[PDB]
Every structure is written in C-alpha cells, then in structure tokens.
Amino acid sequence: EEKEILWNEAKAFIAACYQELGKAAEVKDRLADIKSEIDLTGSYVHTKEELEHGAKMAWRNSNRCIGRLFWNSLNVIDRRDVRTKEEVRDALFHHIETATNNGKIRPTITIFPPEEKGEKQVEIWNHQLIRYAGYESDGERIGDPASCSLTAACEELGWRGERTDFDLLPLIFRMKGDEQPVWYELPRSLVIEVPITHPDIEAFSDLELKWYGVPIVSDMKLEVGGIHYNAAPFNGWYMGTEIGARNLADEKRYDKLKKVASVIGIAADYNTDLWKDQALVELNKAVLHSYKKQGVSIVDHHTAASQFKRFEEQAEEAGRKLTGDWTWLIPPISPAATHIFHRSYDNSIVKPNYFYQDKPYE
Amino acid sequence: EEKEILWNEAKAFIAACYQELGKAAEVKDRLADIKSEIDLTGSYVHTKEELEHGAKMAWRNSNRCIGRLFWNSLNVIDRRDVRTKEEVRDALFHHIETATNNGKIRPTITIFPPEEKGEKQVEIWNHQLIRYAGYESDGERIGDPASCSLTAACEELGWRGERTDFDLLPLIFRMKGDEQPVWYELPRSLVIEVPITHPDIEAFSDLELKWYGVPIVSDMKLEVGGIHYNAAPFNGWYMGTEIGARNLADEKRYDKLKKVASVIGIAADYNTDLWKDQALVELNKAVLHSYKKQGVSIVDHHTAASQFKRFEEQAEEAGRKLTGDWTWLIPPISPAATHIFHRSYDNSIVKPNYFYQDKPYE
Ligand code: HEM
Ligand code: HEM
Ligand SMILES: CNCCc1cccc(OCc2ccc3ccc(N)nc3c2)c1
Ligand SMILES: CNCCc1cccc(OCc2ccc3ccc(N)nc3c2)c1
Ligand SMILES: C[C@H](O)[C@H](O)[C@H]1CNc2nc(N)[nH]c(=O)c2N1
Ligand SMILES: C[C@H](O)[C@H](O)[C@H]1CNc2nc(N)[nH]c(=O)c2N1
Ligand SMILES: [Cl-]
Ligand SMILES: [Cl-]
C-alpha cells in the first residue's frame, strides 16, 4: 500500500533533484530502477549525490530558518554505513570536531542509516549534541531548565552531573534491538566554549556566563523522497540573539536579565525605564563581542536578515517559490529594524525538509 | 435580498448584546420590532444603549489590539444627529478636546450617521484626526512620508502646508451630495504636542523631535449588527513603541536612528555593535520619559502586555473565546520579553468590529 506513498515522494524528488543537477535526461532511467527496487524490496537507496542534494534542498525549504542563503554549501557526511554503537559515537564525535573547525564553523550534517519499516536503526536522544544539563529539586534550580527531562533520563541510566549551571550532557542514543540507550561523556577537548564578556563594561565577567560554540540539532528527522532519516544531526553557526535573547534571557531558561541590569548599573524597578530592553541589548552586544573575540563564528540579526534578503532575491531569480514562517523568521530583538518584519511569507511545507519527531524520554 | 444579510447580523448581535446586558427577556420583542423595521424600511436604528455596547464589543473583538483590557470603559459619543459640515467639524473638534482631557486621555469614539444604501452620509479622509503632513519633491523629503498622498490631496484643495517636518494636516471630510470634501485647519489650542527629551542625555533635545499626544484613528469602519458606521473615529492613548520604534524609527517614516546614535554618542558603523538596537531602546526611553513628564497618558509595552494578559484571563472567566493576531500583538522591541510572544492566538474575525475601507484619495 505504502509503496505508493514512497513512489510518489520518490518521483517528485528525483525529477526536481536531477533537474537542479542538470541531469534531466537521466531521470527516466533512474526512476525505472527505483520503480523496480520499490516493488521488489519495499524501499530504495539514494546515491551519495542524491542524498547530498536532498539534504541541501531540505535546508532550503526550512521555513523557520533565517540562515538559508548558504543552503548549497552544506557539508554532507554520509554515514549510512554505521552498524555499531562505537561507530555512531565516533561519527558524532567527528561531526563535532569537523563542524567546529577550530572556531571557523562549517555548516555540516552527518546522515545515519534511515528508518526501514518505520523501524529506526539509530535513535538519538539529545536535542543538540552539545547542551547543558538542568536540575530542579527542593526549590533548587540549576543549569538549563529546558534540559530537565533529558537530564533526569540520563541520571536514571547511571550518569551523574556535577550540578554546575553548565554540566555538558553526555551523548545518548539507542541502537535498534537494544532496549536501552547508551551514553558517552563528551571529551572536553572537542567542545569549544565562549566566556561572555562585554566590550566596555568590565564588571560583566562577574556574571560568569558562557555558552557552547556550536549548536548541533540532533533530534529532527530529515525526509528526502519518501526516505526517513530520523537520525541526521546538523549544524550552522549561532545568530547572537538565540543566545543573548533566549537561552540566557528567557524566564524559563537562564533568566539573567535582572543580573545583567545590576552589572550594567541600571535599576530594575520600573517598566517605563525599559530596563529589560536595555539589558537585552547589552547582553546581546556581549555575546557577539565574546564569540568574535575568541574567533568563533556567529552572525548578528541584522547581517543575517540582509543575507536572508539575498536568499529571497536568489529564490526569485531561480524561479523557485519562497516559503517562510514570519513568526520564526523575525529576530526577537528589534524585529521591525529588519525587512523581514515588513513583509509576509507563505508558510507552506515543501519537501525535502526537516521535521519534529516524538521524544523517546518523557 | 440583502435585507437577509442585515437581518442575520442583527439577530446575532441583539442576542449577544442583550445577553451581556442582562436583558435577555427583552430580545424576542426587540427582534420583533427590528424584523418589521427591516421589512418596511430596508434598515433599522440602534438604541443609544445598543450602539454604546456594540462599539465596546467591537473594540473587544479587535484581534490586533493589545489594549483591549479596557474595552468596557470606552467613552461613546452618539453623533448620529449631525446633518451639516459645521456640525461634523465641531464634533471632530470636540472629540479631540474631550479625549485629550488636558493629558489624562479618555478612550473615546464619536459615532456619525451610518451608511444608508451603502451610501455614506459623511466620509472622513484623515487617517488620524491629528497627523503630520509629508512632502517629497526634487529629492527633498519633509515631514511624514506616510502622509504624502493625503498631503498632496489637501494641497489640491487650496490648503498649503508650511513644510516643517511637523505641519498639522487640516481635518478633511466629504458630505453626501458634495462632490468635493471641505477642509478645516486644526486650532492649535486643541492639539497637545510633546517635545522628546531623554531622562539623562541632555543632547537628546538637539534632535528637536516631537509627537502629538493623542492618536485618533478616523478612517476605519465600525460594523455593528449589519449597520455600517464608516465614519466613527476612535482613540486610546499611545503605547510608547508606536512612536519610538515605528513613527520615529522606520526608514519609510522619520528614519531617526542614525541621528539618535550620534546624540547618544555611539558609532553607527558596524552591525555587530547593535547600534540600531541601542538607539531604539534610548529613543523609546525618551518617548516614555517625555510623555510622562508632560502629564500626557502613555503606556510602555511591558505594562501593556501585562494588561493584555488580564484581558485574556478576563475573557476566559466570562466564557468568551479570545481572538488575536500575534503578528500585531507582539511589540516591535523586546517582543520575547512579553508573554504574548510565547503563546499562539486564534485570528478569527468576530463581529462587531472595526474594518479597513478604501481611501477616497489615491
Ligand atoms: C549557517 C548558519 C545558520 C543560522 C545562523 C541559522 C539560523 C537559524 C535560526 C535563528 C533559527 C530559529 C531557531 C530558534 O529560534 O529556535 C533557525 C531555525 C532552523 N534552522 Fe537554521 N541556521 C543556520 C543553519 C542551518 C542549517 C545548516 C540547517 C539544516 C541543514 C538549518 C535548519 C533550520 C531548521 C530546520 C530550523 C527550524 C527548527 C524548528 O522548527 O525548530 N539551519 N535557523
Ligand atoms: C486605550 C489605549 C489603547 C492602546 C494602548 C492600544 C494599543 C494598540 C496598538 C499598539 C495597536 C497596533 C497598532 C499599530 O501597530 O499600528 C492597536 C491596534 C488597534 N487598536 Fe488599539 N489601543 C488602545 C485603544 C483602542 C481603542 C479605544 C480602540 C477602538 C475602540 C482600538 C482598536 C484598535 C484597532 C481596530 C486596531 C487595529 C487597527 C488595524 O488593523 O490597523 N484600540 N492598538
Ligand atoms: C527555541 N525553539 C526550540 C524548539 C525546538 C525543538 C527542536 C529543534 C529546534 O531547532 C531550533 C534550531 C534548529 C536549527 C538551527 C540551526 C542553526 C542555528 N543557529 N539555530 C538553529 C535552531 C527547536
Ligand atoms: C502601522 N499600521 C498602519 C496601517 C493602519 C491603517 C489604518 C488604521 C491603523 O490603525 C493602527 C491603530 C489603530 C488603533 C489604535 C488605537 C490606539 C493606539 N494606541 N494605536 C492604534 C493604532 C493602521
Ligand atoms: C502581516 C505582515 O507580517 C506585516 O509585515 C505586518 C507585521 N506587523 C505589523 N505591525 C504593525 N504595528 N504595523 C504594521 O504595519 C505591520 N505589518
Ligand atoms: C507560534 C507561536 O507564536 C510561538 O510562540 C512561537 C513564536 N516564535 C518562536 N520563535 C523561537 N525562536 N522559538 C520559539 O520557541 C517560538 N515560539
Ligand atoms: Cl540553542
Ligand atoms: Cl500612530
């Protein structure tokens, strides 16, 4: 039955992909072989070329992503050959090292074997490969609240965090046929971190804030021509506001604005003073200053929006419809200072693409 | 035919209105009379009570409005009796005076005769009763670009602006049966203006910015039970960001951020400095400081959002569905610091309500 669903998604994708590749003539034949492989096996296998291009198309079609200008330069690592948990661990470790590139971050995706019958071969439990643990007990709040449930899941499995506010969570993933996942502590030599300082307020270091260099989202599914790559972690570099305006700012995350207000020497007593706003701007200047100073890639929300404008222009020139989610494309500080705020975007879902999937903890 | 449309909108509205008024028993009879009046005349007439409540419901159902907590205290002035252009002028003048209230702004709406057959009795050309003129010729840009087309329309009709950046546009409106509108210069004694100063940067006054105290939107149609009040200007007080983050900030409006950056003594050379953001925050602090200091009502975006949260809670307690437009409800600075950013809103249109209508110039 579902060989139907597979076949159509496959037809649609190969047509578009080979088209974009200048390989339109080779379609009729490639579709032939696929049509057979699906009938005989129930599935089909992407060539390295198809997979590379599909991953890139997927990034292109991500409505919520402001960084899409650079879709065609995505570094694609094809790890469909892994069979063991040591191989998976080692692939994840390598992804971190190669994407980090001593600070000159390379947008990279590592692609693991896809689901078979809907049966996962590898299931990654991390939300990002590098993420801080979070604890809550007895009114005591430590670390990143967003991580509380995964952190408790790890500590069931024999891991124990030091309970600093910046414990690195271990890599944790499950292999097909194992009832439980395995976890591996991150080698600290692989993980770049950036201490947050302010370009001119020396007291800012008193907050003793830091963040990791590279966000590597490891819990979304990549879908390409009806093939489901549930384990396919990817990364770009950070936009400063993600760190300065959310991770460090949100009440349900690190909730640092009162503390920022104090070190920058303004009162946090009256709404009409806009002290949250002033705090947000200084925290965000500090984050950009710190990353740049350490030689770790980052982009500010203005430059990002200028880049996205070129992505829009480039879509038009190529004859491709542009899709977008305005509510995620606008930055969370000074959104109306970007062109994004002042236009609308069609939020249709086009495949290939990256999707949410159910967490296996919680 | 359309006596149908009128009758249903009328049924729906009277039911809800009398319900909310504790007057449910009086519905069957009120609907009777309306049912007759529609058959015999093609239309019906709202009692003062119905009109007052409908205007209030309309404000309640305005998805894009963050200030809805205070819907039930709207001051409703019923001017369905006007017949002459001197009466219309004088009603508009009075609205300005009573809503301004020496700075202690009263949310007010003045309601003029409704459309008859779709035939307007009074057509107001102003977008707000108090608005600045705008000019563009020979690379020369003066005043508010948003006003360029109405400003050129007035100058056709024999008005002439002084071409400062803050010329007050005249009131301009057309009466049924006149081919052309009339215009009347605003008496400067009626219009409060606020010079923009900064609480601690004395140089800020060098920008010589100002804005008017009371935004009185005069080009939307109020619709209540199938009756179309195309001329029904209303006002609240300003949220600071409307002035500081848009009117004065937008590139297509007064475009003051570079000038703000200079007077606050920061460079405007690098995106990574977030100088636009820092400028926005200081301009916005200045606007709140200036209004408060002059004793003219204004609300900051945090307090506003706290109020809107209570509106949400109050809707729930009353059994009413909440509708909202997230893309207009979030403020344009520090939106993620408000609860609004972190939830979703249903954007359905519920009547009574305020609607856009076609401009008669341009
Ligand atoms: C190169 C630098 C990149 C930047 C600066 C960037 C920027 C962003 C930002 C700011 C968001 C919003 C995330 C949030 O607010 O939680 C986002 C979402 C997203 N980005 Fe990118 N991105 C980049 C690269 C990538 C890459 C390489 C991919 C995949 C190949 C990707 C796919 C996505 C997806 C799928 C989302 C939405 C996830 C969701 O719905 O939660 N981006 N991006
Ligand atoms: C009492 C103080 C009030 C505040 C602070 C307030 C705040 C706001 C703000 C900030 C907007 C967004 C406007 C924009 O960004 O251009 C807005 C939209 C709106 N408000 Fe309110 N408002 C208030 C009173 C009122 C009143 C009295 C009414 C009508 C009775 C009203 C009806 C609306 C409508 C219809 C819109 C949307 C107009 C459109 O679609 O362009 N508001 N309000
Ligand atoms: C704040 N949103 C959290 C909910 C959620 C759940 C799963 C994935 C997810 O991704 C956000 C996301 C995804 C990809 C990114 C790529 C680069 C980048 N700088 N940020 C990125 C941010 C976000
Ligand atoms: C920036 N939007 C301009 C487009 C447009 C066209 C016609 C009306 C309009 O209203 C915005 C609006 C409406 C009512 C308001 C009431 C109070 C207030 N403080 N702002 C308010 C702002 C807005
Ligand atoms: C709908 C579309 O996103 C459009 O850019 C909206 C965004 N929100 C807005 N908000 C305000 N206050 N004023 C506007 O003109 C717009 N435009
Ligand atoms: C869709 C709904 O508006 C929701 O609050 C969205 C808004 N935009 C967001 N933007 C980011 N970056 N992260 C989020 O979690 C959300 N949540
Ligand atoms: Cl993150
Ligand atoms: Cl305005």
Side-chain angles (χ1 to χ4, degrees), chain A residues 245-246 250 271-274 276-278 280-282 284-285 288 300-303 326-327 330-337 341-342, chain B residues 245-246 250 271-274 276-278 280-282 284-285 288 300-303 326-327 330-337 341-342:
Chain A
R246 313 292 313 283
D250 279 2
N271 283 351
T272 47
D273 288 341
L274 308 194
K276 287 188 164 145
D277 310 86
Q278 195 166 334
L280 278 166
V281 170
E282 299 295 355
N284 279 277
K285 283 158 73 178
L288 293 166
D300 65 278
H301 51 291
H302 309 283
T303 304
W326 188 98
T327 79
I330 62 165
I333 62 204
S334 316
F341 180 98
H342 302 269
Chain B
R246 313 292 313 283
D250 279 2
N271 283 351
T272 47
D273 288 341
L274 308 194
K276 287 188 164 145
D277 310 86
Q278 195 166 334
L280 278 166
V281 170
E282 299 295 355
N284 279 277
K285 283 158 73 178
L288 293 166
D300 65 278
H301 51 291
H302 309 283
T303 304
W326 188 98
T327 79
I330 62 165
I333 62 204
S334 316
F341 180 98
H342 302 269

Coordinates of all heavy atoms in Angstrom, one line a residue, chain A residues 245-246 250 271-274 276-278 280-282 284-285 288 300-303 326-327 330-337 341-342, chain B residues 245-246 250 271-274 276-278 280-282 284-285 288 300-303 326-327 330-337 341-342:
Chain A
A245 N 19.2 36.5 23.7 CA 17.8 37.0 23.8 C 16.9 35.9 24.3 O 15.8 36.1 24.7 CB 17.3 37.7 22.5
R246 N 17.4 34.6 24.2 CA 16.5 33.5 24.6 C 17.2 32.6 25.6 O 16.8 32.5 26.7 CB 16.1 32.7 23.4 CG 15.5 33.6 22.3 CD 14.2 34.3 22.8 NE 13.3 33.3 23.3 CZ 12.5 32.4 22.6 NH1 12.6 32.4 21.3 NH2 11.8 31.5 23.3
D250 N 15.4 34.1 28.6 CA 14.0 33.7 28.9 C 13.9 33.3 30.4 O 14.8 32.7 31.0 CB 13.7 32.5 28.1 CG 13.3 32.8 26.6 OD1 13.3 34.0 26.2 OD2 13.0 31.8 25.9
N271 N 8.9 49.5 34.8 CA 8.7 49.0 33.4 C 9.1 50.2 32.5 O 9.8 50.0 31.5 CB 7.3 48.6 33.2 CG 6.9 47.2 33.7 OD1 7.8 46.4 34.1 ND2 5.6 46.8 33.6
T272 N 8.7 51.4 32.8 CA 8.9 52.6 31.9 C 10.3 53.0 31.7 O 10.6 53.8 30.8 CB 8.1 53.8 32.5 OG1 8.4 53.9 33.8 CG2 6.6 53.7 32.3
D273 N 11.2 52.4 32.5 CA 12.6 52.6 32.3 C 13.1 51.6 31.2 O 14.2 51.8 30.6 CB 13.5 52.2 33.6 CG 13.3 53.3 34.7 OD1 12.9 54.5 34.4 OD2 13.6 53.0 35.8
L274 N 12.3 50.7 30.7 CA 12.8 49.8 29.7 C 14.1 49.1 30.1 O 15.0 48.8 29.2 CB 12.9 50.5 28.3 CG 11.7 51.3 27.9 CD1 11.9 51.7 26.4 CD2 10.5 50.5 28.1
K276 N 14.6 46.0 31.0 CA 14.7 44.7 30.3 C 15.3 44.9 28.9 O 16.2 44.1 28.4 CB 13.4 43.9 30.2 CG 13.0 43.4 31.6 CD 11.8 42.4 31.4 CE 11.6 41.6 32.7 NZ 10.1 41.4 32.9
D277 N 14.8 45.9 28.2 CA 15.2 46.1 26.9 C 16.7 46.5 26.8 O 17.4 46.0 26.0 CB 14.3 47.2 26.3 CG 12.9 47.0 26.5 OD1 12.3 47.3 27.6 OD2 12.2 46.4 25.6
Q278 N 17.1 47.4 27.7 CA 18.5 47.9 27.8 C 19.4 46.8 28.1 O 20.5 46.6 27.5 CB 18.6 49.0 28.8 CG 19.9 49.8 28.7 CD 19.9 51.1 29.4 OE1 18.8 51.7 29.7 NE2 21.0 51.6 29.8
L280 N 18.8 43.5 27.6 CA 18.8 42.6 26.4 C 19.8 43.1 25.3 O 20.6 42.4 24.8 CB 17.4 42.5 25.7 CG 16.4 41.5 26.4 CD1 15.0 41.7 26.0 CD2 16.9 40.1 26.1
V281 N 19.8 44.4 25.1 CA 20.8 45.0 24.1 C 22.2 44.8 24.6 O 23.0 44.4 23.8 CB 20.5 46.4 23.8 CG1 21.6 47.0 23.0 CG2 19.1 46.5 23.0
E282 N 22.5 45.0 25.9 CA 23.9 44.9 26.3 C 24.3 43.4 26.4 O 25.4 43.1 26.0 CB 24.1 45.6 27.7 CG 23.8 47.1 27.6 CD 24.8 47.8 26.7 OE1 25.8 47.2 26.2 OE2 24.6 49.1 26.6
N284 N 23.2 41.1 24.5 CA 23.4 40.7 23.1 C 24.7 41.3 22.4 O 25.3 40.6 21.6 CB 22.2 41.0 22.3 CG 21.2 39.9 22.4 OD1 21.3 38.8 21.7 ND2 20.2 40.1 23.3
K285 N 25.1 42.5 22.8 CA 26.4 43.0 22.4 C 27.5 42.2 22.9 O 28.5 42.0 22.3 CB 26.6 44.5 22.9 CG 25.7 45.5 22.1 CD 25.5 46.8 22.9 CE 26.8 47.7 23.0 NZ 26.6 48.9 23.7
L288 N 28.0 38.8 21.0 CA 28.7 39.0 19.7 C 30.2 39.3 20.0 O 31.1 38.7 19.3 CB 28.0 40.1 18.9 CG 26.6 39.7 18.5 CD1 25.8 40.9 18.0 CD2 26.7 38.6 17.4
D300 N 25.2 38.4 13.6 CA 24.2 39.3 14.3 C 22.9 39.2 13.5 O 22.9 38.8 12.3 CB 24.7 40.7 14.4 CG 24.8 41.4 13.1 OD1 25.9 41.1 12.4 OD2 23.9 42.1 12.6
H301 N 21.8 39.7 14.1 CA 20.5 39.5 13.4 C 20.3 40.5 12.2 O 19.5 40.2 11.3 CB 19.3 39.6 14.4 CG 19.4 40.8 15.3 ND1 20.3 41.0 16.3 CD2 18.6 41.9 15.4 CE1 20.1 42.2 16.9 NE2 19.1 42.7 16.4
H302 N 21.0 41.6 12.2 CA 20.9 42.5 11.0 C 21.6 41.9 9.8 O 21.0 41.9 8.7 CB 21.5 43.9 11.3 CG 20.9 44.5 12.6 ND1 19.7 45.0 12.6 CD2 21.4 44.5 13.8 CE1 19.4 45.4 13.9 NE2 20.5 45.2 14.6
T303 N 22.8 41.4 10.0 CA 23.6 40.8 8.9 C 22.8 39.5 8.4 O 22.6 39.3 7.2 CB 25.0 40.4 9.4 OG1 25.6 41.6 9.9 CG2 25.8 39.8 8.2
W326 N 7.0 33.7 9.2 CA 7.3 35.0 9.7 C 7.5 35.0 11.2 O 8.4 35.7 11.7 CB 6.2 35.9 9.3 CG 6.3 37.4 9.6 CD1 6.7 38.4 8.6 CD2 6.1 38.1 10.8 NE1 6.7 39.6 9.2 CE2 6.3 39.5 10.5 CE3 5.6 37.7 12.1 CZ2 6.2 40.5 11.5 CZ3 5.5 38.7 13.0 CH2 5.8 40.1 12.8
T327 N 6.8 34.2 11.9 CA 6.8 34.2 13.4 C 8.1 33.7 13.9 O 8.5 33.9 15.0 CB 5.6 33.5 14.0 OG1 5.8 32.1 14.0 CG2 4.3 33.8 13.3
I330 N 11.3 36.5 12.1 CA 11.7 37.8 12.7 C 12.6 37.5 13.9 O 12.4 36.6 14.7 CB 10.5 38.6 13.1 CG1 9.6 37.9 14.1 CG2 9.7 39.0 11.9 CD1 8.6 38.8 14.8
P331 N 13.7 38.4 14.2 CA 14.5 38.2 15.4 C 13.8 38.6 16.6 O 12.9 39.4 16.5 CB 15.8 39.0 15.1 CG 15.2 40.1 14.1 CD 14.2 39.4 13.3
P332 N 14.3 38.2 17.8 CA 13.5 38.6 19.0 C 14.0 39.9 19.6 O 13.5 40.4 20.6 CB 13.7 37.5 20.0 CG 15.1 37.0 19.7 CD 15.2 37.1 18.2
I333 N 14.9 40.5 18.9 CA 15.2 41.9 19.3 C 15.2 42.8 18.1 O 15.7 42.4 17.0 CB 16.4 42.2 20.3 CG1 17.7 41.8 19.6 CG2 16.2 41.5 21.7 CD1 18.7 41.4 20.6
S334 N 14.7 44.0 18.3 CA 14.5 45.0 17.1 C 14.0 44.4 15.9 O 14.5 44.7 14.8 CB 15.8 45.7 16.8 OG 16.4 46.2 18.0
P335 N 12.9 43.5 15.9 CA 12.5 42.9 14.7 C 12.1 43.9 13.6 O 12.3 43.6 12.5 CB 11.3 42.1 15.1 CG 10.8 42.7 16.4 CD 12.0 43.2 17.1
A336 N 11.4 45.0 14.0 CA 11.0 45.9 13.0 C 12.2 46.7 12.3 O 12.0 47.4 11.3 CB 9.9 46.9 13.5
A337 N 13.4 46.4 12.7 CA 14.5 47.0 12.0 C 15.0 46.2 10.9 O 16.0 46.5 10.2 CB 15.7 47.3 13.0
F341 N 10.3 41.8 9.0 CA 9.1 42.2 9.8 C 8.1 42.9 8.8 O 6.9 42.8 9.1 CB 9.5 43.2 10.9 CG 8.4 43.7 11.7 CD1 8.1 43.1 13.0 CD2 7.7 44.8 11.3 CE1 7.1 43.6 13.7 CE2 6.6 45.4 12.1 CZ 6.3 44.7 13.3
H342 N 8.6 43.5 7.8 CA 7.7 44.4 7.0 C 7.1 43.7 5.7 O 6.5 44.3 4.9 CB 8.4 45.7 6.5 CG 8.9 46.4 7.7 ND1 8.1 47.4 8.3 CD2 10.0 46.4 8.4 CE1 8.7 47.9 9.3 NE2 9.9 47.3 9.4
Chain B
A245 N 9.4 53.3 18.1 CA 10.0 52.2 17.3 C 9.5 52.1 15.9 O 10.0 51.4 15.1 CB 9.7 50.8 18.1
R246 N 8.5 52.9 15.6 CA 7.9 53.0 14.2 C 7.9 54.4 13.7 O 8.6 54.7 12.7 CB 6.6 52.2 14.2 CG 6.6 50.9 14.9 CD 7.5 49.9 14.1 NE 7.2 49.9 12.7 CZ 6.2 49.3 12.1 NH1 5.3 48.6 12.9 NH2 5.9 49.4 10.8
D250 N 11.2 54.0 11.7 CA 11.1 53.3 10.4 C 11.8 54.1 9.3 O 11.6 55.3 9.2 CB 9.6 53.0 9.9 CG 9.0 51.9 10.6 OD1 9.6 51.2 11.5 OD2 7.8 51.6 10.3
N271 N 27.2 46.5 12.2 CA 26.0 45.7 12.6 C 26.2 45.1 14.0 O 25.4 45.1 14.9 CB 25.6 44.7 11.6 CG 24.9 45.3 10.3 OD1 24.6 46.5 10.2 ND2 24.7 44.4 9.3
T272 N 27.4 44.4 14.2 CA 27.7 43.7 15.4 C 27.7 44.5 16.7 O 27.7 44.0 17.8 CB 29.0 43.0 15.3 OG1 30.0 43.9 14.8 CG2 28.9 41.8 14.3
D273 N 27.8 45.9 16.5 CA 27.7 46.8 17.6 C 26.2 46.9 18.1 O 25.9 47.4 19.2 CB 28.2 48.2 17.3 CG 29.7 48.2 17.2 OD1 30.4 47.3 17.7 OD2 30.3 49.2 16.6
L274 N 25.2 46.4 17.3 CA 23.8 46.6 17.7 C 23.5 48.0 18.0 O 22.6 48.3 18.9 CB 23.5 45.7 18.9 CG 23.9 44.2 18.8 CD1 23.2 43.4 19.9 CD2 23.5 43.8 17.4
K276 N 21.7 50.1 16.1 CA 20.3 50.3 15.9 C 19.5 49.9 17.1 O 18.5 50.6 17.6 CB 19.7 49.6 14.7 CG 20.2 50.2 13.4 CD 19.5 49.5 12.2 CE 19.7 50.4 10.9 NZ 19.8 49.5 9.7
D277 N 19.8 48.8 17.7 CA 19.1 48.3 18.8 C 19.2 49.2 20.0 O 18.3 49.6 20.7 CB 19.6 46.9 19.2 CG 19.6 46.0 18.0 OD1 20.7 46.1 17.2 OD2 18.7 45.3 17.7
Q278 N 20.5 49.6 20.3 CA 20.8 50.5 21.4 C 20.1 51.9 21.2 O 19.5 52.5 22.2 CB 22.3 50.8 21.5 CG 22.7 51.4 22.9 CD 24.2 51.3 23.1 OE1 24.9 50.3 22.6 NE2 24.7 52.2 23.9
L280 N 17.3 52.4 19.4 CA 15.8 52.1 19.6 C 15.5 52.1 21.1 O 14.5 52.8 21.5 CB 15.5 50.7 19.0 CG 15.2 50.7 17.5 CD1 15.1 49.3 16.8 CD2 13.9 51.5 17.2
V281 N 16.3 51.5 21.9 CA 16.0 51.5 23.3 C 16.1 52.9 23.9 O 15.2 53.3 24.7 CB 16.9 50.5 24.1 CG1 16.8 50.7 25.6 CG2 16.6 49.1 23.7
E282 N 17.0 53.7 23.5 CA 17.1 55.0 24.1 C 16.1 55.9 23.6 O 15.5 56.7 24.4 CB 18.5 55.6 23.9 CG 19.7 54.9 24.5 CD 19.6 54.8 26.1 OE1 18.7 55.5 26.7 OE2 20.4 54.1 26.7
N284 N 13.2 55.0 22.7 CA 11.9 54.6 23.4 C 11.8 55.0 24.9 O 10.7 55.3 25.4 CB 11.7 53.1 23.2 CG 11.0 52.8 21.8 OD1 9.8 53.0 21.7 ND2 11.9 52.5 20.8
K285 N 13.0 55.0 25.5 CA 13.0 55.5 26.9 C 12.7 57.0 26.9 O 12.0 57.5 27.8 CB 14.4 55.4 27.5 CG 14.8 53.9 28.0 CD 16.3 53.7 28.1 CE 16.9 54.4 29.3 NZ 18.3 54.1 29.4
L288 N 8.8 57.7 26.5 CA 8.0 57.5 27.7 C 8.3 58.6 28.7 O 7.4 59.1 29.4 CB 8.4 56.1 28.3 CG 7.9 54.9 27.4 CD1 8.6 53.6 27.8 CD2 6.4 54.9 27.5
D300 N 3.9 51.8 28.5 CA 5.1 51.0 27.9 C 4.6 49.7 27.5 O 3.5 49.2 27.9 CB 6.2 50.9 28.9 CG 5.8 50.1 30.1 OD1 5.1 50.6 31.0 OD2 6.1 48.9 30.1
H301 N 5.4 49.0 26.6 CA 4.9 47.7 26.1 C 4.9 46.6 27.1 O 4.1 45.6 26.9 CB 5.8 47.3 24.8 CG 7.3 47.4 25.0 ND1 8.0 48.5 25.2 CD2 8.2 46.4 25.1 CE1 9.2 48.3 25.4 NE2 9.4 47.0 25.3
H302 N 5.7 46.7 28.2 CA 5.6 45.6 29.2 C 4.3 45.7 30.0 O 3.6 44.7 30.2 CB 6.8 45.7 30.2 CG 8.1 45.7 29.5 ND1 8.6 44.6 28.9 CD2 8.9 46.7 29.1 CE1 9.8 44.9 28.3 NE2 10.0 46.2 28.4
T303 N 3.9 46.9 30.5 CA 2.7 47.1 31.2 C 1.5 46.8 30.3 O 0.6 46.1 30.8 CB 2.6 48.6 31.7 OG1 3.8 48.9 32.4 CG2 1.4 48.8 32.5
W326 N -1.2 37.5 16.5 CA 0.1 37.5 17.1 C 1.0 38.5 16.5 O 1.9 39.2 17.1 CB 0.6 36.1 17.1 CG 1.8 35.8 17.8 CD1 1.9 35.2 19.1 CD2 3.2 35.9 17.4 NE1 3.3 35.0 19.4 CE2 4.1 35.5 18.4 CE3 3.8 36.4 16.2 CZ2 5.5 35.5 18.3 CZ3 5.2 36.5 16.1 CH2 6.0 36.0 17.1
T327 N 0.9 38.6 15.1 CA 1.9 39.4 14.4 C 1.7 40.8 14.6 O 2.6 41.6 14.4 CB 1.9 39.1 12.9 OG1 0.8 39.8 12.3 CG2 1.7 37.6 12.6
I330 N 2.5 41.2 19.3 CA 3.8 41.4 19.8 C 4.4 42.8 19.6 O 4.2 43.4 18.6 CB 4.8 40.3 19.3 CG1 5.0 40.5 17.8 CG2 4.3 38.9 19.6 CD1 6.2 39.8 17.2
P331 N 5.0 43.4 20.6 CA 5.6 44.7 20.4 C 6.8 44.7 19.5 O 7.5 43.7 19.4 CB 6.0 45.2 21.8 CG 6.2 43.9 22.6 CD 5.2 42.9 22.0
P332 N 7.2 45.8 18.9 CA 8.4 45.7 18.0 C 9.7 45.9 18.7 O 10.8 45.9 18.0 CB 8.2 46.8 17.0 CG 7.5 47.9 17.8 CD 6.6 47.2 18.8
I333 N 9.7 46.0 20.0 CA 11.0 45.9 20.7 C 10.9 44.9 21.9 O 9.9 44.9 22.5 CB 11.7 47.2 21.1 CG1 10.9 48.0 22.1 CG2 12.1 48.2 19.8 CD1 11.2 49.4 22.0
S334 N 11.9 44.1 22.1 CA 11.9 43.0 23.0 C 10.7 42.2 23.1 O 10.2 41.9 24.1 CB 12.2 43.5 24.5 OG 13.3 44.5 24.5
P335 N 10.1 41.8 21.9 CA 8.9 41.0 21.9 C 9.0 39.8 22.8 O 8.0 39.5 23.5 CB 8.6 40.7 20.5 CG 10.0 40.7 19.9 CD 10.7 41.9 20.5
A336 N 10.1 39.1 22.7 CA 10.2 37.8 23.5 C 10.2 38.1 25.1 O 10.2 37.1 25.9 CB 11.3 36.9 23.0
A337 N 10.2 39.3 25.5 CA 10.2 39.6 26.9 C 8.7 39.7 27.4 O 8.5 39.9 28.6 CB 10.9 40.9 27.3
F341 N 4.6 36.8 23.0 CA 5.4 36.1 22.1 C 5.4 34.6 22.3 O 5.6 33.8 21.3 CB 6.9 36.6 22.3 CG 7.9 36.0 21.3 CD1 8.3 36.7 20.2 CD2 8.5 34.8 21.7 CE1 9.2 36.1 19.3 CE2 9.5 34.3 20.9 CZ 9.8 35.0 19.7
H342 N 5.1 34.1 23.5 CA 5.3 32.7 23.8 C 4.0 31.9 23.8 O 4.0 30.7 24.1 CB 6.0 32.6 25.2 CG 7.3 33.2 25.3 ND1 8.5 32.6 25.0 CD2 7.7 34.5 25.6 CE1 9.5 33.4 25.1 NE2 9.0 34.6 25.5

